[PDB]
Amino acid sequence: LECGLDKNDYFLENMSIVMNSQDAVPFLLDPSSHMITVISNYYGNKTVLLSFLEEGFVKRLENAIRFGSVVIIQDGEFF
Amino acid sequence: LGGCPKERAEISMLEGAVLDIRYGVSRIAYSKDFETLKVDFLSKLPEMLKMFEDRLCHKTYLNGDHVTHPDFMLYDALDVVLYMDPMCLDAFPKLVCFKKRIEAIPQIDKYLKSSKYIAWPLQGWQATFGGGDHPPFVIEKSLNRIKKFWKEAQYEVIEHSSGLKLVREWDVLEQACKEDLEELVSMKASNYYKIFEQDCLDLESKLTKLSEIQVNWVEVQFYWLDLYGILGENLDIQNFLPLETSKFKSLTSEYKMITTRAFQLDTTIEVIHIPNFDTTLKLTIDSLKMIKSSLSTFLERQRRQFPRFYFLG
Amino acid sequence: SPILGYWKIKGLVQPTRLLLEYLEEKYEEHLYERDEGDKWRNKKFELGLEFPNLPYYIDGDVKLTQSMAIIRYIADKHNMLGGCPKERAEISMLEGAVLDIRYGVSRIAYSKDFETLKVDFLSKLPEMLKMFEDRLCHKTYLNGDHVTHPDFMLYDALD
Secondary structure, eight states: OOSOOOSOHHHHHHHHHHHHOOSSOOOOOOSSTTHHHHHHHHHGGGEEEEOTTSTTHHHHHHHHHHTTOEEEESOOSOO | OOSSHHHHHHHHHHHHHHHHHHHHHHHTTSOTTHHHHHHHHHHHHHHHHHHHHHHTTTOSBTTBSSOOTHHHHHHHHHHHHHHHOSSTTTTOHHHHHHHHHHHHSHHHHHHHTSTTOOOSOSSOTTOSTTOOSOOOOOHHHHHHHHHHHHTSOOOEEEEOSSSOEEEEOHHHHHHHHHHHHHHHHHTSSOSTTTTTHHHHHHHHHHHHHHHHHHHHHHHHHHHHHHHIIIIISOSHHHHHOHHHHHHHHHHHHHHHHHHHHHHTTOOSGGGGGSTTHHHHHHHHHHHHHHHHHHHHHHHHHHHHHSTTHHHHO | OOEEEEESSSTTTHHHHHHHHHTTOOOEEEEEOTTOHHHHHHHTTSSOOSSOSSSEEESSSOEEESHHHHHHHHHHTTSOSOSSHHHHHHHHHHHHHHHHHHHHHHHHHSOTTHHHHHHHHHHHHHHHHHHHHHHTTTOSBTTBSSOOTHHHHHHHHHO
């Protein structure tokens, strides 16, 4: 909540589902990209944002995986 | 050890070839250059390794169908050379086998799992190769590939109709620098880069300076080549613009010496070490822009005098 | 008559050359000069040596490289390995200690830091020489009443 998660019980349950289990990658859908910043406030410096549409994506992820960087990928529709 | 001359020398030849690997390591292990030297070692290595691959064909152990100490040697060797090169054994599946075979022997396997087994390091901690106490890593493996890449920097050089030589195919090196720069920034995210980090910060200062001079140099190269079409060739155009052509030619001299001095260095990176490069080109591009700006004022003032010229272009 | 390839210098063949001359056995040579680095690379692969390099020795389809494997071969082909497990292992230990001197030389010899590195080589050398001084108390040659091939190895080193 301190990051800026919404008060709604629905949005609490959702955030819980994202975090609590990560034996698998979570897919976040939100029209208002309010959520992209919530996860950013949580991981701080470590937060590196990418998008399937940028050209350097292919290499930037290889750099992200090698040095423990927490990654959010901005365009999930295109994969 | 063997029964007599022949069988004893056979078992010693196994001893020997094992040492020709253990020793081969130590000869390039103290070296400061190790990340570059292994290349020429691994090229020779084949010739030596081959002999062992053959010996291992149709035989259970070197020196025969009865197991010798050489089998426990090859096992250790194979385990060790794979760390030095990940692909060195893949071309000898016969050894990859012998290795697993040995590890299968109940006494041996019980040992590898025992307390007496030293899992690492490979050499004395002090050694450059296989040293250190810091059980794991890719910070060094990558930085070796970065430095290797920048001591192979090549600029296609192609001289045009007049004096000066042109640098073709900018983007490739241009891209690589930006990528390699992004790589070092993401290296700060890593936990294990802290002390090894200081040197990378020096390589960061070296490449951030290389992009500083990369940005300005393509501008100069571009703006000069364009202006060369316009004033470099005609007498009539330089007749109309005397102050403009006298200032173009003065920069043409400087840049001719700047290129030929920079190419003969034979390392694009080494260019950052050259005196007054960022300052030279920043000042050259400023003056090149003043000529192009003055031509632009000439054409528009020509057009305003006879407003048909507005149609022409 | 065996065929021996090596530099025209003492280098990696000397001990072997002596042993051969000791058994008055004849042989023929491929001598590479110091600046004939080509002539070698020209035959480096046209010889069928089991570890192409210098030196390399070829006899009755006995293809050898590695000074030790070579010398031992010639030696063994004339029953000179030793008369029991003990005396055979003793002769091998001599082989070893001789190389711990021949090699000891080469590790401080290529160094640019030679003028001060030889100092640490010569300080270790004594401990090696000493063992031979003792062995030579109440014996005629190292390892007994007959001169051994390891004595020809130590002689190259000494030189």
